[PDB]
Design a protein around this ligand. Structure first.
Ligand SMILES: Cc1cc2nc3c(=O)[nH]c(=O)nc-3n(C[C@H](O)[C@H](O)[C@H](O)COP(=O)(O)OP(=O)(O)OC[C@H]3O[C@@H](n4cnc5c(N)ncnc54)[C@H](O)[C@@H]3O)c2cc1C
Ligand SMILES: Cc1cc2nc3c(=O)[nH]c(=O)nc-3n(C[C@H](O)[C@H](O)[C@H](O)COP(=O)(O)OP(=O)(O)OC[C@H]3O[C@@H](n4cnc5c(N)ncnc54)[C@H](O)[C@@H]3O)c2cc1C
Ligand SMILES: [Cl-]
Ligand SMILES: [Cl-]
Ligand SMILES: [Cl-]
Lengths: 585, 579, 75
């Protein structure tokens, strides 16, 4: 006899969990979320919000609230390598699409920019949105202990940490959003692939007016090396509030004792990284963080689905962790809604693993290689163990000399610096991932490809599994994206001139499946216009064709022309995995 | 074969029709709206937004946009009777719940205030919200010509006025939102009851800095009488942007040359009303419009439903027309949504007329009686036709003498002033209307009644048919009304401690009817809190009981205790009029 | 749809009767350029004719138009 019955139990109220609660809130699905801690994040942790996250927050209706508090992209314009903050600079690249060679592609790719908003500010914004909708319930100070699942539901044991009293929750489904060392994932018998404690990071949150060393070269990341240090002893400054509020990251050797409470010693390390004793440093927090590089081989078992840091862990390079957490929960929730309605079978819920687990592998691999690229810069300079400050100042000074030695060091520094685009301008990784199996019906066309590095370069496509291309439309006098007039908990069929047969096809699809397909003509039927012609360029179907958009803004299917309209009802049945045991496997 | 097939055609793009397109947008219902004019309203027209409209705009997600542009309630604090604007004042009452004797009741009654936002500003906000949703389609410059309907739908003939191209729309339902002289209502064979041209009103929109004559007595309405005029020649000043943007209203006798383009003449008239020839007056527009008071005996026929000015017309007094237009469309759209999904029949759509026609009768009668009350002030002062300026100045001055004559006029003024509460503080009209037949199950309790004038005084109740009472809840640390956590396209069952049996009952109701009833415990089960205990006081059920709230914020049913749980499935089948 | 140049054509005009709006102070101060035919009598003092033409170019008579200057220029 269970204490609570609810359609969905969310375990964990970090970004992944709160994203799932907000999505289910927007879709009208009652849920309970339990979070072990009494409050939201009390330190910055992850901060970089990429364009995909920006699009998901527009769909969930919180983008304006996030933007009001976040650092804007133009104050993240560079990625800097330096000696001390007050000393000579080593190298610099354009970051986050601000450089003239990337800014066009970044603007064409999304209605959203990149911005910077740390977790102690983001999480309260998600909490407020969830409380305002009043569809599900948040319980902070409540700890998940264990689960059993069966054919029909999931029975979970929960502890109220204040009262010490246990209770049980019976749910149709459970979301594991409980972060690294997930108890939910463990209870499923799923063990991550990869290494644990591959490094420690010591992250210090502090206040210091460093505007004299930063404002002329605005950046999110200033990566420093104090002359007389081995190459591994890099000092990473992260701008949180230009140019007064900061993180400082060090990577202590495996055999160093870190006293997180020793503010005195941490303050002296930061003053050494700055190299200007007149800058007053106030410590706000110091945290030691075990860095892993690991990914779950399976994301789900039965009626339990794990998201975010429960199924992927990586170094902070690329800032992919937070963005991938948001996109995991946004992939899953519209699928749980249709299953709970009886409009989709367990076959649709299986596509969560099929679509998201390969992205988990991709981001863990990319973040690892970007962490290893960092040491290339001080190596190119000729920095090693056992060098005096004076020897390293001389290597920096002799860098610009008219010798064979200096020419080769300048070449090695340019090559080491070029590789940092893999973390500063990784547009293909951020926006260009495509689901190749899952809640989609291939059209028989080959995947578009070119000679450009697919990690660095995004290429807009309606190929099924791809995120729908962004184009500026106009609805009367209202400027709106292709991504703004799709999603929001429904399927949308984008059509054009000569697309009338799509209306009866969509009508038949909804009758056969009980799922509505909204028909939206662009540049026809009095619908939104394509003022620049950009949508006609990107849609890759003819005027009479169609692009079928899922509730998460990925393309489920496309059709060159209205010759394919009669396929739509069967396409929708296959996307929804509607349990037809005669249906064709 | 029709040109266009669409669930709902809305005819008319004023407040009523734009509200319907916004509600249908929020509910995900594809629709088409045609409006004969190429633009939204080009002059202020209706401006007073009452608390109930504020609540509906909170439901439809646009109340913050409206509030950013509107005059706030505290700047509409008085209703003023005066001579000239620059001359001596005659009388004053508190307005719109600003007086100390009404402010408490107005604050407890709603999460929303009253505000002032003219139609030329409000209509673009609704259009923008509809275009942003991109669920339905707006076509301005398109004119409805005629319809025919059958068992299965409605076929309308439309003309594109710029091209003269004609086309046909086949819709399941049609909303007539086409305003006064509704072409849609006519084609239904339904004629209004009440008179036409009961008067002519001349409305001048102008700019003048009158802060010196208004700031010390903030009002929406300054009602003046230039000494040497008959009582019927009242000048109504309406504040639009304190204190530089105004309307000036007059009621010329049904015989008089009204040149609307004669600006220099209107301008001279406004200057005389002000009584201070140094004030610069810039005319922005002059409009003549015929004041009616009629109400349709029937709001609907078959698959066609008429809202707002199509079905009720009244003088501007009480500003009920704009508010009632919004509440008509909000009553109707959630019922259409359940009808289109096959979860309700024509029986639910019949409740539109049953609920809203009686409110149309009430507002037309109240507004007429409020218009008639206005002449009572100048009459109390002893003003009549055929008096000189000096004669009327003398009567103003003598009003405060220690004579019997002056004692009597003083008493007659006070009584005529007290009647203006029926337009200035008519809280029971604005918020307290209750549906007694329609999409509701009466609980078998007698309707709460009391001694207070029910036009003036709102009495909060969960008696089925009433608007759900406002209480402040807190959901975690988020402050929210009972009205914020209900509505928004769904049925909600508010419960309390010992209400667990309502869980199984709502699930059974969903199985039998196909309509979800969201269960929301207050002060139990980790749900929203009632920090003051106000909700426990207003809910008029026990802790273990239930209040069933409709998508429009009205109560469909209540139950004293959890023993009534087993009744919820049949209650839901009767509210939805399932065969 | 922010622009320096908004080039209009009032339906029922010859192609050569283009109306060019030039944004000078977004969105309250403007130029309006026409190219009258070589026959036309241009009266740079008839503010009320010029005003009626701008209102026509705009297509919304609720927009108040205040003339600052009219000039004819030999291209
Ligand atoms: C100390 C620390 C510092 C970090 N700093 C950075 C950084 O600088 N840059 C960067 O890019 N990434 C960083 N990360 C990772 C980043 O914070 C995550 O990628 C991001 O929060 C997404 O995580 P999530 O919501 O999946 O999990 P989390 O943020 O870990 O949240 C999961 C939540 O579940 C709760 N929980 C755990 N067990 C239970 C249970 N049994 N019952 C109920 N609740 C439970 C936890 O209390 C926690 O609130 C850091 C991580 C940690 C742990
Ligand atoms: C000149 C004027 C001044 C007013 N001033 C005041 C005031 O000061 N105070 C006050 O309280 N009330 C006033 N009103 C009334 C007030 O505007 C209405 O109560 C309010 O507009 C709500 O109206 P609605 O949406 O029902 O209709 P409306 O605002 O009349 O809008 C209906 C729309 O339908 C369109 N239409 C008509 N026929 C067709 C067709 N065949 N096809 C397509 N579309 C069609 C019209 O173009 C119009 O835009 C005024 C009305 C008028 C006409
Ligand atoms: Cl804690
Ligand atoms: Cl938003
Ligand atoms: Cl709002």
């Amino acid at each position: 006899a269970p204490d609570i019955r609810v359609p969905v139990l969310i375990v964990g109220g970090g970004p992944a969990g709160l994203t799932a609660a907000l999505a289910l809130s927007r879709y009208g699905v009652p849920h309970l979320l339990v979070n072990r801690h009494h409050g939201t994040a009390h330190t910055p942790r992850a901060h970089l919000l990429n364009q995909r996250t920006g699009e998901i927050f527009r769909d969930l209706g919180i983008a304006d609230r996030v933007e009001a508090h976040a650092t804007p992209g133009h104050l993240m314009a560079n990625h800097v390598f330096m000696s001390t903050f007050a000393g000579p600079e080593v190298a610099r690249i354009g970051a986050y699409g601000n450089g003239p060679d990337r800014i066009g592609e970044y603007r064409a790719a999304s209605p959203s920019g990149l911005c910077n908003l740390p977790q102690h500010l983001l999480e309260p914004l998600l909490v407020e949105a969830v409380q305002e909708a009043c569809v599900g319930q948040l319980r902070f100070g409540h700890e998940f202990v264990s689960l059993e699942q069966d054919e029909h539901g999931v029975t979970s044991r929960i502890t109220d940490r204040r009262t010490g009293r246990d209770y049980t929750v019976r749910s149709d489904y459970l979301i594991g959003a409980d972060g690294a060392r997930s108890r939910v994932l463990a209870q499923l018998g799923i063990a991550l692939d990869g290494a644990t404690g591959i490094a420690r990071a010591v992250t210090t949150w502090f206040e210091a007016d460093l505007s004299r060393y930063s404002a002329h070269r605005p950046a999110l990341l200033y990566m420093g090396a104090v002359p007389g240090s081995p190459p591994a002893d890099g000092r990473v400054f992260v701008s949180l509030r230009p140019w007064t509020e900061w993180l400082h990251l060090t990577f202590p050797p495996p055999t160093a004792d870190v006293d997180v409470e020793d503010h005195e010693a941490v303050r002296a390390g930061i003053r050494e990284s700055i190299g200007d004793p007149t800058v007053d440093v106030t410590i706000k927090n110091v945290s030691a963080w075990e860095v892993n590089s690991a990914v779950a081989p399976r994301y789900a078992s039965g009626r339990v689905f794990c998201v975010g840091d429960a199924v992927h862990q990586n170094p902070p390079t690329n800032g992919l962790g937070l963005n991938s957490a948001v996109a995991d929960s946004f992939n899953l929730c519209w699928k749980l809604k249709l299953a709970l309605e009886g409009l989709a079978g367990p076959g649709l819920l299986d596509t969560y693993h099929d679509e998201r687990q390969p992205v988990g592998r991709q981001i863990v691999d990319r973040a690892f290689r970007s962490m290893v690229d960092l040491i290339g810069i001080p190596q190119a300079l000729g920095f090693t163990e056992g060098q005096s400050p004076e020897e390293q100042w001389r290597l920096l000074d002799t860098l610009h000399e008219d010798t064979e030695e200096a020419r080769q060091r300048r070449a090695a520094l340019a090559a080491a610096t070029a590789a940092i685009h893999g973390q500063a301008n990784a547009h293909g990784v951020e926006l260009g991932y495509r689901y190749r199996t899952g809640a989609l019906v291939p059209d028989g066309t080959p995947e578009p490809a070119d000679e450009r590095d697919p990690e660095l370069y995004y290429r807009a496509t309606t190929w099924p599994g791809a995120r729908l291309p962004h184009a500026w439309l106009e609805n009367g006098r209202h400027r709106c994206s292709t991504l703004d007039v799709t999603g929001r908990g429904r399927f949308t069929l984008l059509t054009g001139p000569g697309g009338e047969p799509w209306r009866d096809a969509a009508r038949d699809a909804a009758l056969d499946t009980g799922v509505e397909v909204a028909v939206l003509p662009i540049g026809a039927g009095g619908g939104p216009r394509d003022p620049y012609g950009t949508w006609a360029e990107l849609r890759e179907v003819e005027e009479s064709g169609a692009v079928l958009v899922r509730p998460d803004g990925h393309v489920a299917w496309r059709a060159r022309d209205h010759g394919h309209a009669k396929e739509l009802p069967e396409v929708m049945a296959r996307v929804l995995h509607q349990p037809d045991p005669a249906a064709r496997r």
